[PDB]
Amino acid sequence: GLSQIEPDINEDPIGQFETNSIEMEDFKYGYYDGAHTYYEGEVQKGTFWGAIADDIAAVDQTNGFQGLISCMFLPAIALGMYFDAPGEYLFIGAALFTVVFCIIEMDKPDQPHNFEPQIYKLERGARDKLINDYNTMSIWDFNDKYGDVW
Amino acid sequence: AVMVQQIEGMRDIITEKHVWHLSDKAIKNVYMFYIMFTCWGCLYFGSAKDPFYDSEEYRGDGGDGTGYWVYETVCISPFLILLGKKEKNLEMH
Amino acid sequence: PPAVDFAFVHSVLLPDGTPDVHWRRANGGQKLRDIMLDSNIELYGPYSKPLSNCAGVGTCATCMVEIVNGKELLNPRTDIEKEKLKRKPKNWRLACQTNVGNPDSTGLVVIQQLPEWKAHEWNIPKNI
Amino acid sequence: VRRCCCVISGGVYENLLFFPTIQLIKDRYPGVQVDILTTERGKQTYELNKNVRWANVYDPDDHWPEPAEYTDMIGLLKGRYYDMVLSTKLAGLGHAAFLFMTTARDRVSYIYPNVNSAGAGLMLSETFTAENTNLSELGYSMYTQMEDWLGRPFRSVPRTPLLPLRVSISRKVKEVVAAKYRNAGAVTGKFIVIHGIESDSKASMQSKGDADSLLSLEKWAKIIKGVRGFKPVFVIPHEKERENVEDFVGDDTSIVFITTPGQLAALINDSAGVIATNTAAIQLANARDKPCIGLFSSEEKGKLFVPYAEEKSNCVIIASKTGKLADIDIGTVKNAMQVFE
Ligand code: FES
């Protein structure tokens, strides 16, 4: 991880083969392995649709249109057979879907996890590539700490 | 399809032998559908909130996406603290 | 005659709430299991049935006995007691692997039998 | 020179006593990006230099490394484009070829006295034949040939020492060792380190030439009972000794687990006293002008590992009359009461 100080060398290189787990002397069965946890009563509702759509909404960067086309793409190729047999229409439409998705994925948000590691200093919200076309900010030289606070 | 086979030891056998195959075109079509599914997933899940490579855990410390960023970081931050230590000794500890 | 003075505090306290000391006389040092069995005191506990223990060799950790005031006349831990029990308070020895010495021996070893299934801790004075 | 490697060896102690040499190098030339190709347990010491750059881990005293690792480090020293090497690995041929394979303008190394240095002069700029084959047995200096070559009189004075062993601690190691001894029963001002415990561990920072350097615990119990308590914090090299120390000197005594020499120096800088035996703790105490006493197994090793005891006026060196580290445990207490307050 970080290890700002140098870590302590382990005087016990446990073994080339055996795992790094604790022994059975110190193993509290049931609670560690989950063999006697999960007392029903602390559980929650959301029966299989209030937790699927919750998980879809948990991990999604899709807007109204991009996303709707994602939901209707694979049903379109699934009905490319068993309803008709177009042929090259399927591939042309799939390429069109890919290209329009990539054009849409030039998102107005830039989400600073996209940028280089050297950018993470502080105050990176004042950096706005989101609106400023032709940024013209020579900070990607990465050999000296310029003050970009203006 | 139906065949009766006599065997001395145990019993008779009523083999059926439905010789079939997916066919040359349907194999191409399942290749097609799986490649299209790969396209759909590569785009959609590529446009998903990748929770690990977004936070200050990965992107904070280093987080370039390499495999040497850990080792070059823990080889540089010793150098950065040594340089800051020389700067501290430059101004009387 | 050379008599070693055992005590053999039982693990279960009496209904009074006080421990019971039995003071077995058995002579000499051969093996604490054979002493506690020849002199008929509870060593094993629920493992006292025939095949429920290894019966002297040391392959089970069943005849373990907490021994205090016993740094005087014992054999050291024979690396079976040091291995078959590994994380114990170090006053606990296996009776059939330990040995209280030779025939010409006198001493006041007090050996709390059945340290498992006990309520007391014995508060041994810190060594050195 | 502009970039300078260092292929040193020995562990914690021998990597520590090389800090005068590296400060000498950085004093000789204006700007030297110094690098160290040392063993593990040696890189940790290179938190305390403020004069080094990389400090990689090689263990050059392996003699039989993985060819992948060997070629990796050869190409690394090549691609860093050094101008000096200054091994003090104490080997001639074989290792001389390892220094020659590095594109270095001035290959400098130590040399075995035996026949093992059959052809080291064919590859090295300097020879530096040595003594005892166990150079840490030579004592504290260990580098007088390397020093009296480095910055020889060509234009100016050598100035081979610069207030010897100016180690330096960072603020993060200071904070974490402060939290360590505050989790112990110690206060930042009034406490005393120990760093002598019978163990079987390389974290005690002993030496490569000293075997009877670490003192027992019952004798240490008698030593520490002879002295009134200025809260002596115990510096164990491994946690297995903790339950041993509490079994010997008592549960009330506070023990601090330090294996990193940087953390050890951060403990020294906050301590107001040192009762170390012949470990790196003595030299880390002589650094930053801290009061030590410095037990030893003989006056010979005491003079060899502490020659400058008459210059700090606090490290009242102690030894044993006979060998095997069986000291008096009486007068050491007296001058400990003298110097610690
Ligand atoms: S009876 Fe099996 S250990 Fe003593």
XYZ file of C-alpha atoms and ligand atoms in Angstrom:
716
model
C 0.000 0.000 0.000
C 1.378 3.368 1.099
C 4.092 2.321 3.596
C 5.511 5.779 4.253
C 8.013 4.233 6.663
C 9.841 1.142 5.541
C 7.829 -1.925 6.640
C 9.112 -4.415 9.170
C 10.673 -7.533 7.681
C 8.962 -10.674 8.952
C 11.451 -12.907 10.757
C 9.120 -15.895 10.112
C 8.806 -16.664 6.387
C 5.920 -19.004 7.210
C 6.569 -21.405 4.350
C 6.902 -21.748 0.597
C 3.716 -23.835 0.378
C 1.431 -23.652 3.405
C -1.040 -20.788 3.434
C -0.811 -17.645 5.565
C -3.916 -18.461 7.606
C -4.201 -18.594 11.369
C -4.058 -21.977 13.054
C -7.084 -23.837 14.376
C -5.993 -22.983 17.924
C -6.959 -19.336 17.371
C -9.814 -19.903 14.889
C -13.206 -18.906 16.290
C -15.483 -21.206 14.327
C -18.918 -20.048 13.264
C -18.213 -16.330 13.504
C -15.189 -16.202 11.200
C -16.283 -18.690 8.542
C -19.920 -17.609 8.717
C -21.098 -21.087 9.707
C -23.169 -19.781 12.654
C -23.738 -16.132 11.677
C -26.736 -14.862 9.664
C -29.449 -14.964 12.289
C -32.557 -14.180 10.262
C -34.123 -11.066 11.734
C -31.463 -8.586 10.642
C -32.249 -9.264 6.952
C -34.103 -6.866 4.647
C -36.771 -6.961 1.943
C -36.298 -6.067 -1.734
C -37.372 -9.416 -3.163
C -35.245 -9.852 -6.261
C -36.377 -6.746 -8.177
C -35.891 -4.121 -5.486
C -32.271 -5.304 -5.313
C -31.507 -6.062 -8.969
C -32.549 -2.619 -10.188
C -30.850 -1.240 -7.081
C -27.625 -2.948 -8.165
C -28.025 -1.791 -11.765
C -28.483 1.748 -10.456
C -25.493 1.194 -8.161
C -23.102 0.705 -11.111
C -24.173 2.756 -14.133
C -22.929 5.738 -16.135
C -25.728 5.378 -18.706
C -28.074 8.330 -19.361
C -31.618 8.136 -20.750
C -30.792 7.431 -24.431
C -27.366 5.754 -24.076
C -28.594 2.857 -21.905
C -31.991 2.616 -23.568
C -30.160 1.633 -26.735
C -28.048 -0.671 -24.560
C -31.193 -2.356 -23.239
C -32.671 -2.642 -26.756
C -29.489 -3.746 -28.557
C -29.193 -7.377 -27.489
C -32.950 -7.940 -27.874
C -32.527 -6.629 -31.427
C -29.792 -9.148 -32.211
C -31.723 -11.882 -30.410
C -34.624 -11.129 -32.763
C -32.161 -10.987 -35.638
C -32.883 -14.711 -35.544
C -36.165 -16.478 -34.685
C -38.085 -13.544 -36.278
C -36.170 -12.840 -39.505
C -32.733 -13.309 -41.098
C -31.501 -9.895 -42.300
C -27.773 -10.629 -42.482
C -25.436 -7.684 -42.984
C -28.084 -5.355 -41.524
C -27.291 -6.747 -38.071
C -23.584 -5.996 -38.368
C -24.086 -2.538 -39.854
C -26.490 -1.701 -37.037
C -24.110 -3.096 -34.431
C -21.264 -0.984 -35.798
C -23.562 2.048 -35.787
C -24.425 1.279 -32.159
C -20.763 0.979 -31.211
C -19.779 4.223 -32.927
C -22.687 6.235 -31.534
C -21.929 4.808 -28.094
C -18.296 5.874 -28.373
C -19.330 9.337 -29.555
C -21.676 9.488 -26.578
C -18.878 8.267 -24.299
C -17.075 11.531 -25.037
C -18.983 12.543 -21.953
C -19.530 16.097 -20.827
C -18.293 14.963 -17.387
C -14.601 14.069 -17.326
C -14.493 12.356 -13.905
C -10.896 12.987 -12.683
C -10.221 9.282 -12.130
C -9.729 9.304 -15.915
C -6.671 11.558 -15.704
C -3.021 10.801 -14.984
C -1.790 9.957 -11.464
C 0.377 13.082 -11.335
C -2.739 15.270 -11.541
C -3.929 14.262 -8.058
C -2.445 17.017 -5.907
C -5.471 19.003 -4.633
C -8.091 21.502 -5.902
C -8.498 19.604 -9.205
C -12.078 20.877 -9.552
C -10.749 24.246 -10.713
C -9.232 22.354 -13.608
C -12.134 22.254 -16.086
C -11.482 20.307 -19.262
C -15.241 19.656 -19.217
C -16.104 22.990 -20.887
C -12.782 24.503 -21.977
C -12.032 23.369 -25.513
C -8.338 23.639 -26.419
C -7.288 23.668 -22.784
C -3.734 24.966 -23.381
C -2.322 24.177 -19.934
C 1.261 22.866 -19.956
C 1.021 20.774 -16.800
C 1.506 17.387 -18.521
C 5.284 17.899 -18.738
C 5.544 16.116 -15.359
C 9.001 17.368 -14.439
C 8.230 20.374 -12.204
C 5.458 21.499 -9.858
C 3.817 24.469 -11.550
C 1.186 26.500 -9.743
C -1.928 26.008 -11.869
C -4.150 27.975 -9.439
C -5.510 30.699 -11.687
C -32.831 -45.289 -34.792
C -34.258 -48.122 -32.701
C -32.058 -51.219 -32.547
C -32.388 -54.343 -30.411
C -29.006 -55.834 -29.489
C -28.585 -59.298 -27.992
C -25.916 -59.818 -25.329
C -25.126 -63.129 -23.659
C -24.547 -61.808 -20.159
C -27.050 -59.273 -18.903
C -29.986 -58.168 -21.059
C -31.155 -56.617 -24.347
C -30.363 -53.036 -25.374
C -32.774 -50.694 -27.183
C -30.294 -48.097 -28.526
C -31.788 -45.010 -30.209
C -28.855 -43.010 -31.655
C -30.214 -39.591 -32.571
C -27.269 -38.509 -34.704
C -27.571 -34.732 -34.957
C -25.403 -31.608 -35.238
C -25.904 -27.840 -34.560
C -25.155 -27.307 -38.347
C -22.595 -25.087 -40.171
C -24.815 -21.953 -40.245
C -26.101 -22.123 -36.631
C -22.499 -22.428 -35.384
C -21.673 -19.260 -37.295
C -24.784 -17.658 -35.802
C -23.828 -18.462 -32.214
C -20.356 -17.100 -32.939
C -22.168 -14.017 -34.242
C -24.437 -13.658 -31.228
C -21.621 -14.144 -28.748
C -19.426 -11.583 -30.501
C -22.366 -9.173 -30.453
C -22.812 -9.889 -26.747
C -19.116 -9.189 -26.270
C -19.585 -5.868 -28.060
C -22.576 -5.004 -25.886
C -20.759 -5.842 -22.679
C -17.464 -4.237 -23.691
C -19.344 -1.002 -24.259
C -21.866 -1.101 -21.416
C -19.790 -2.536 -18.572
C -16.948 -0.420 -19.900
C -19.348 2.462 -19.228
C -20.025 1.122 -15.713
C -18.898 2.600 -12.416
C -15.688 0.645 -11.934
C -15.585 1.092 -8.144
C -11.997 0.018 -7.508
C -10.135 2.011 -10.173
C -11.934 5.291 -9.372
C -11.365 5.891 -5.655
C -8.430 7.323 -3.712
C -7.283 3.767 -2.966
C -5.971 3.084 -6.471
C -6.020 6.509 -8.120
C -4.919 8.261 -4.939
C -1.565 6.747 -4.015
C -0.392 6.144 -7.564
C -2.969 4.556 -9.790
C -1.629 4.848 -13.320
C -2.984 1.372 -14.104
C 0.435 -0.290 -14.339
C 1.891 -3.028 -12.133
C 5.115 -1.183 -11.285
C 3.374 1.856 -9.804
C 3.432 0.240 -6.363
C 7.124 -0.555 -6.544
C 8.231 2.696 -8.157
C 6.027 4.593 -5.644
C 7.537 2.843 -2.602
C 10.921 3.416 -4.266
C 10.174 7.118 -4.832
C 8.504 8.057 -1.543
C 11.689 6.988 0.268
C 13.487 9.361 -2.083
C 10.914 12.099 -1.486
C 11.243 11.828 2.284
C 15.034 11.772 1.905
C 14.859 14.919 -0.231
C 12.560 16.602 2.276
C 15.001 15.554 4.988
C 17.865 17.179 3.109
C 15.694 20.276 2.757
C 15.083 20.196 6.511
C 18.822 19.864 7.192
C 19.325 22.748 4.744
C 17.460 24.987 7.236
C 18.903 23.569 10.482
C 16.640 20.525 11.081
C 11.160 -44.095 53.037
C 11.630 -41.545 50.219
C 8.084 -40.239 49.737
C 7.080 -37.515 47.289
C 4.131 -35.477 48.555
C 1.476 -35.031 45.887
C -1.677 -32.980 46.476
C -3.970 -33.431 43.433
C -6.411 -30.574 43.765
C -9.599 -31.532 41.949
C -10.983 -29.223 39.277
C -14.549 -29.251 40.579
C -14.916 -27.257 43.756
C -16.838 -28.769 46.611
C -20.374 -27.530 47.332
C -18.793 -25.497 50.132
C -16.903 -23.595 47.434
C -13.441 -24.725 48.625
C -11.057 -27.022 46.700
C -10.418 -30.593 47.812
C -6.856 -31.853 48.309
C -6.297 -35.609 48.430
C -2.579 -36.049 49.277
C -1.530 -39.242 47.509
C 1.653 -40.796 48.916
C 2.881 -42.863 45.947
C 6.603 -43.533 46.100
C 9.292 -42.584 43.626
C 9.272 -41.087 40.171
C 8.317 -43.251 37.205
C 5.387 -41.521 35.459
C 2.682 -39.217 36.781
C 0.006 -41.108 34.839
C 1.061 -44.410 36.381
C 1.207 -42.728 39.787
C -2.266 -41.208 39.483
C -3.650 -44.507 38.116
C -1.904 -46.812 40.594
C -3.006 -44.506 43.410
C -6.507 -44.063 41.900
C -7.155 -40.375 41.329
C -9.072 -38.842 38.425
C -6.531 -37.990 35.718
C -8.407 -38.276 32.430
C -11.937 -37.153 33.259
C -14.409 -38.007 30.481
C -11.521 -39.681 28.627
C -11.244 -42.215 31.472
C -12.952 -44.833 29.307
C -10.568 -47.448 27.840
C -9.970 -46.393 24.209
C -10.791 -42.704 24.752
C -7.095 -41.957 25.412
C -3.701 -43.099 24.153
C -2.967 -44.819 27.483
C 0.520 -43.492 28.122
C 2.471 -42.844 24.934
C 1.570 -39.163 24.471
C -0.299 -39.070 21.150
C -3.422 -37.411 22.622
C -3.568 -34.254 24.747
C -5.881 -35.846 27.321
C -3.962 -36.437 30.575
C -2.897 -32.813 30.882
C -2.496 -31.598 34.448
C -1.692 -28.126 35.701
C 1.316 -28.399 38.003
C 2.354 -25.567 40.298
C 5.135 -25.580 42.878
C 6.795 -28.098 40.565
C 9.957 -26.445 39.293
C 11.914 -28.624 41.741
C 11.693 -32.341 40.833
C 10.386 -32.940 37.321
C 11.750 -33.877 33.958
C 11.637 -31.006 31.455
C 9.061 -30.927 28.666
C 10.020 -33.769 26.332
C 9.001 -31.935 23.083
C 5.745 -33.922 23.025
C 4.402 -31.792 25.861
C 5.980 -28.821 24.073
C 4.147 -29.731 20.826
C 0.955 -31.656 21.607
C 0.025 -28.627 23.671
C 1.425 -25.422 22.187
C -0.581 -22.484 23.591
C -1.129 -23.164 27.291
C -0.081 -21.298 30.463
C 3.067 -23.506 30.609
C 2.174 -24.958 34.028
C 0.338 -27.759 32.179
C 2.148 -31.050 31.590
C 1.032 -34.437 30.325
C 1.118 -36.901 33.199
C 2.340 -39.871 31.151
C 5.207 -37.961 29.508
C 6.347 -36.138 32.640
C 8.336 -37.817 35.405
C 8.721 -36.578 38.978
C 12.273 -37.924 39.322
C 13.979 -40.943 40.823
C 13.089 -43.253 43.838
C 15.203 -41.248 46.309
C 13.030 -38.148 46.047
C 11.102 -35.885 48.415
C 9.004 -32.887 47.443
C 5.681 -31.067 47.650
C 4.464 -30.989 44.052
C 0.839 -29.814 43.816
C -0.809 -30.885 40.561
C -4.293 -29.596 39.779
C -5.885 -32.388 37.780
C -8.252 -31.604 34.902
C -7.202 -28.019 34.160
C -9.780 -27.986 31.416
C -13.215 -27.758 33.006
C -12.105 -25.616 35.945
C -13.167 -22.312 37.494
C -9.917 -21.109 39.132
C -6.725 -19.617 37.702
C -4.257 -20.348 40.601
C -2.481 -16.903 40.456
C 1.072 -18.349 40.330
C 3.648 -15.799 41.656
C 5.500 -14.304 38.633
C 8.768 -16.199 37.898
C 12.106 -14.295 38.286
C 31.372 12.136 -10.635
C 27.626 12.743 -10.927
C 26.011 9.393 -10.025
C 27.595 7.020 -7.508
C 26.566 3.467 -6.678
C 27.405 1.560 -3.484
C 27.386 -2.248 -3.340
C 27.885 -2.442 0.418
C 26.994 -5.410 2.615
C 26.794 -6.694 6.170
C 23.291 -5.788 7.310
C 22.171 -3.051 9.686
C 25.430 -2.176 11.400
C 27.716 -2.138 8.371
C 25.192 -0.143 6.345
C 24.950 2.352 9.212
C 28.685 3.014 9.521
C 28.784 3.822 5.783
C 26.911 7.107 6.349
C 30.170 8.974 7.066
C 31.429 7.685 3.723
C 28.346 8.836 1.818
C 28.426 12.240 3.488
C 32.108 12.341 2.543
C 31.166 11.650 -1.069
C 28.513 14.361 -1.118
C 30.988 16.761 0.528
C 33.732 15.952 -1.987
C 31.649 16.718 -5.095
C 28.770 19.257 -5.143
C 25.940 17.103 -6.494
C 25.983 13.309 -6.296
C 22.860 11.225 -6.752
C 23.998 8.355 -4.529
C 22.538 4.868 -4.889
C 23.021 1.797 -2.705
C 22.854 -1.834 -3.812
C 22.777 -3.426 -0.345
C 21.148 -6.338 1.459
C 17.768 -6.390 3.120
C 17.981 -5.033 6.665
C 20.325 -2.466 5.070
C 17.849 -0.502 2.987
C 15.922 0.337 6.159
C 18.940 2.198 7.546
C 18.791 4.383 4.437
C 15.822 6.210 5.790
C 18.456 7.972 7.936
C 20.845 9.578 5.423
C 19.183 12.561 3.574
C 22.033 12.041 1.032
C 20.831 8.964 -0.916
C 18.403 8.328 -3.788
C 17.282 4.721 -4.418
C 18.731 2.151 -1.953
C 17.749 -1.061 -3.714
C 17.887 -4.574 -2.220
C 20.367 -7.069 -3.688
C 22.174 -9.025 -0.948
C 25.532 -8.975 -2.772
C 27.002 -11.471 -0.281
C 24.771 -14.195 -1.832
C 27.600 -15.271 -4.251
C 25.047 -17.535 -6.011
C 22.085 -15.383 -7.033
C 19.310 -16.079 -9.465
C 20.656 -15.281 -12.969
C 17.423 -13.383 -13.569
C 18.115 -11.191 -10.535
C 21.834 -10.995 -11.316
C 21.296 -9.859 -14.888
C 18.419 -7.561 -13.825
C 20.665 -5.702 -11.361
C 23.608 -5.665 -13.782
C 21.442 -4.017 -16.410
C 20.010 -1.698 -13.771
C 23.422 -0.432 -12.702
C 24.230 -0.111 -16.404
C 21.085 1.864 -17.237
C 21.592 4.227 -14.318
C 24.942 5.250 -15.877
C 27.134 5.592 -12.818
C 30.596 7.133 -12.570
C 31.728 5.388 -9.361
C 30.801 2.176 -7.554
C 32.573 1.909 -4.164
C 31.542 -1.648 -3.408
C 32.971 -2.640 -0.017
C 31.455 -6.038 -0.726
C 34.889 -7.509 0.074
C 35.428 -9.665 -2.970
C 37.871 -9.649 -5.848
C 37.320 -11.585 -9.051
C 33.772 -12.565 -9.895
C 32.487 -9.471 -8.147
C 35.093 -7.338 -9.891
C 33.508 -8.519 -13.129
C 30.123 -7.554 -11.688
C 31.426 -4.021 -11.158
C 33.116 -3.976 -14.567
C 29.945 -5.043 -16.372
C 28.443 -1.840 -15.018
C 29.472 1.056 -17.221
C 31.428 2.816 -14.476
C 34.336 5.189 -14.936
C 35.888 4.536 -11.496
C 35.330 1.007 -10.189
C 36.220 1.002 -6.481
C 36.029 -2.075 -4.280
C 37.444 -4.007 -1.361
C 39.530 -7.133 -1.833
C 39.976 -10.420 -0.036
C 43.460 -10.962 1.447
C 43.413 -14.592 0.292
C 43.938 -15.929 -3.247
C 40.276 -15.276 -4.073
C 41.309 -11.853 -5.443
C 43.356 -13.432 -8.197
C 42.499 -10.893 -10.910
C 40.610 -8.033 -9.287
C 43.156 -5.414 -10.363
C 42.322 -6.053 -14.017
C 38.855 -4.512 -13.510
C 39.127 -2.060 -10.590
C 40.608 1.397 -10.219
C 41.429 0.819 -6.527
C 42.505 -2.327 -4.693
C 41.813 -1.881 -0.937
C 43.163 -5.130 0.410
C 41.564 -5.750 3.790
C 41.930 -7.443 7.186
C 40.338 -10.444 8.909
C 38.004 -11.214 5.939
C 35.149 -10.106 8.259
C 35.495 -6.352 7.886
C 32.977 -5.467 10.605
C 35.408 -7.152 13.009
C 37.728 -4.246 12.179
C 35.300 -2.106 14.181
C 33.572 1.235 13.825
C 35.787 2.675 11.134
C 35.772 -0.229 8.657
C 36.253 2.201 5.746
C 39.535 4.005 6.464
C 40.973 2.744 3.193
C 37.811 3.782 1.351
C 37.782 7.104 3.200
C 41.501 7.842 2.807
C 41.051 7.238 -0.904
C 37.848 9.261 -1.166
C 38.838 12.901 -1.388
C 42.567 12.328 -1.255
C 44.592 15.556 -1.365
C 44.500 16.601 -5.016
C 43.321 20.219 -4.680
C 41.923 20.650 -1.146
C 41.702 18.991 2.271
C 40.118 15.510 2.635
C 37.780 16.316 5.546
C 36.954 12.635 5.821
C 34.653 13.055 8.865
C 31.764 15.498 9.047
C 30.804 15.222 12.741
C 30.649 11.438 12.305
C 27.290 9.694 11.822
C 24.797 12.508 11.407
C 21.765 10.275 11.064
C 18.446 12.052 10.634
C 14.874 10.995 11.366
C 11.718 11.955 9.514
C 8.563 13.273 11.142
C 6.377 10.283 10.244
C 8.712 7.759 11.863
C 8.966 10.159 14.801
C 5.181 10.262 15.121
C 4.688 6.514 14.873
C 7.468 5.740 17.360
C 6.015 8.398 19.656
C 2.668 6.635 19.469
C 4.527 3.390 20.140
C 6.210 4.515 23.353
C 3.096 6.423 24.452
C 1.111 3.215 24.036
C 3.836 1.959 26.349
C 4.142 3.512 29.801
C 6.677 6.126 28.709
C 6.682 9.906 28.365
C 8.469 11.607 25.485
C 11.050 13.249 27.751
C 11.921 10.940 30.643
C 12.545 7.431 29.383
C 15.510 5.232 28.508
C 15.914 2.664 25.732
C 17.621 -0.707 26.220
C 18.105 -2.634 22.952
C 20.016 -5.489 24.573
C 18.015 -8.724 24.774
C 18.938 -12.374 24.294
C 17.222 -13.360 21.047
C 17.709 -15.238 17.780
C 16.921 -12.529 15.248
C 18.698 -10.286 12.770
C 16.695 -7.235 13.910
C 18.977 -6.667 16.920
C 21.472 -4.973 14.566
C 24.502 -6.614 16.107
C 27.372 -7.038 13.618
C 29.022 -9.546 11.300
C 32.142 -9.867 13.497
C 30.656 -10.002 17.012
C 28.961 -13.137 18.360
C 28.692 -12.482 22.123
C 27.256 -9.004 21.613
C 23.783 -9.490 23.130
C 23.380 -9.803 26.872
C 21.151 -12.203 28.769
C 17.932 -11.146 30.518
C 18.516 -12.335 34.088
C 21.809 -10.475 34.060
C 19.889 -7.611 32.478
C 17.279 -7.987 35.213
C 20.006 -7.615 37.824
C 21.412 -4.620 35.943
C 18.045 -2.877 35.779
C 17.145 -3.715 39.383
C 20.471 -2.300 40.536
C 19.386 1.046 39.049
C 16.397 3.051 40.191
C 13.828 3.266 37.425
C 14.009 6.164 34.992
C 11.347 4.175 33.093
C 13.594 1.933 30.943
C 11.679 1.037 27.777
C 12.719 -2.322 26.357
C 13.504 -2.634 22.650
C 12.783 -6.209 21.573
C 13.750 -7.518 18.096
C 10.690 -9.800 18.003
C 7.394 -10.169 19.826
C 8.334 -13.630 21.138
C 10.700 -11.888 23.559
C 7.920 -9.723 25.038
C 6.307 -12.548 27.006
C 9.866 -13.561 27.913
C 10.836 -10.102 29.162
C 7.658 -9.814 31.218
C 8.535 -13.246 32.619
C 12.016 -12.048 33.665
C 11.982 -8.371 34.698
C 8.249 -8.052 35.468
C 4.879 -7.236 33.952
C 5.146 -3.572 34.971
C 8.102 -2.949 32.656
C 7.135 -1.356 29.356
C 8.358 -2.985 26.140
C 8.426 -1.368 22.696
C 8.734 -3.502 19.555
C 11.269 -1.911 17.189
C 12.968 -3.758 14.332
C 13.404 -0.926 11.843
C 16.609 1.052 12.569
C 14.836 4.218 11.460
C 12.207 3.641 14.131
C 15.051 2.888 16.522
C 16.719 6.220 15.807
C 13.359 7.935 16.221
C 13.227 6.284 19.643
C 16.766 7.434 20.434
C 16.062 11.051 19.505
C 13.163 11.152 21.973
C 15.025 9.177 24.639
C 17.197 10.778 27.323
C 19.472 7.783 27.855
C 20.825 4.594 26.285
C 22.055 1.382 27.925
C 22.743 -0.424 24.668
C 25.094 -3.325 24.144
C 27.128 -3.594 20.946
C 24.319 -2.944 18.460
C 23.465 -0.080 16.132
C 21.807 1.583 19.131
C 25.196 2.736 20.443
C 26.038 4.550 17.230
C 22.526 5.941 16.893
C 22.976 7.251 20.447
C 26.351 8.802 19.677
C 24.506 10.401 16.792
C 22.411 13.343 18.008
C 24.590 13.607 21.147
C 22.463 11.307 23.286
C 23.897 9.863 26.537
C 24.855 6.197 26.210
C 26.932 3.841 28.333
C 27.617 1.154 25.738
C 28.233 -2.264 27.264
C 30.725 -4.502 25.469
C 32.295 -7.943 25.765
C 35.848 -6.555 25.756
C 37.770 -3.306 25.821
C 39.202 -4.253 22.421
C 35.788 -4.403 20.751
C 34.817 -1.312 22.726
C 37.715 0.696 21.335
C 37.161 -0.725 17.855
C 33.417 0.010 17.720
C 33.629 3.217 19.792
C 36.985 4.948 19.157
C 35.582 8.460 19.665
C 34.229 7.963 23.187
C 36.468 10.823 24.378
C 34.728 13.292 22.008
C 31.055 13.161 23.070
C 31.745 13.232 26.839
C 28.564 11.251 27.610
C 29.117 7.737 26.230
C 31.013 6.368 29.215
C 32.076 3.120 27.578
C 31.747 -0.090 29.601
C 33.259 -3.491 28.878
C 33.831 -6.869 30.526
C 37.092 -7.811 32.199
C 37.029 -11.400 30.984
C 35.364 -12.378 27.718
C 31.922 -13.874 27.056
C 30.178 -10.619 28.162
C 30.201 -11.131 31.933
C 30.464 -7.541 33.113
C 30.497 -6.060 36.618
C 26.869 -4.813 36.770
C 27.919 -2.537 39.683
C 29.937 0.452 38.479
C 27.930 0.605 35.268
C 25.011 1.447 37.558
C 27.054 4.164 39.260
C 28.073 6.029 36.120
C 24.582 5.410 34.724
C 23.242 7.375 37.690
C 25.978 9.908 36.971
C 25.321 10.485 33.279
C 21.541 10.094 32.931
C 20.772 13.014 35.265
S -2.703 -40.452 27.890
Fe -2.518 -39.817 25.807
S -1.272 -38.150 26.481
Fe -1.083 -39.099 28.442
